[PDB]
Amino acid sequence: GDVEKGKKIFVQKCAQCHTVEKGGKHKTGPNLHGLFGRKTGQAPGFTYTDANKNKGITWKEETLMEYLENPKKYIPGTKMIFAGIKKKTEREDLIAYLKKATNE
Numbered sequence: 001g002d003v004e005k006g007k008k009i010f011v012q013k014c015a016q017c018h019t020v021e022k023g024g025k026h027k028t029g030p031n032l033h034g035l036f037g038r039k040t041g042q043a044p045g046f047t048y049t050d051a052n053k054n055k056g057i058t059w060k061e062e063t064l065m066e067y068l069e070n071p072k073k074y075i076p077g078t079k080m081i082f083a084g085i086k087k088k089t090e091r092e093d094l095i096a097y098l099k100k101a102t103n104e
C-alpha cells in the first residue's frame with residue numbers, strides 16, 4: 001500500500017530488534033543499512049549467524065519479499081525469532097517503506 005503504513009508497522013514489530021529508524025542501532029537484528037541493492041554481511045559488529053551473510057542473496061524487493069514471508073526457508077540458519085508479519089499488505093508496506101528508506 002504505502003510508505004507510512006510500512007514505517008509505522010516497522011517501528012512496532014521491527015524497530016523492536018532492528019532500531020534503524022531513530023539513532024541507527026541493532027538490538028537483536030542489524031540496522032537496515034541502505035538495503036535495497038546492497039549485500040548481506042554488512043552490520044558493524046552485530047554478531048549474527050554465519051549462514052545469512054555467507055548465502056550473499058542481495059537485498060531488494062524480491063529477496064526481502066521471500067525473506068520476510070519465509071526467512072529460514074529462503075536462507076538457512078537465519079535466527080530471526082519472528083518469521084512473518086500478519087497481513088500481506090503490511091508485507092507490501094514494508095517493501096514500499098524500505099524501497100524509500102535508502103533514499104528517503
Ligand code: HEC
Pocket residue numbers: 010013014015016017018028029030032035039040041042048049052053064068077078079080081082084085094
Ligand atoms: C528480533 C527478535 C527480530 C525481530 C522482531 C525481527 N528481526 Fe529481522 N532479523 C533478526 C535477526 C536475528 C537477523 C540477523 C540475520 C539472520 O538472518 O539471522 C535479522 C535479519 C533481518 C534482515 C536481513 C539483514 C541482513 O542480512 O542484511 C532484514 C531485512 C530484517 N531482519 C527485517 C526485519 C523486519 C522488517 C522486521 C519486522 C517485521 C524484523 N526483521 C523483525 C531478528 C529480528
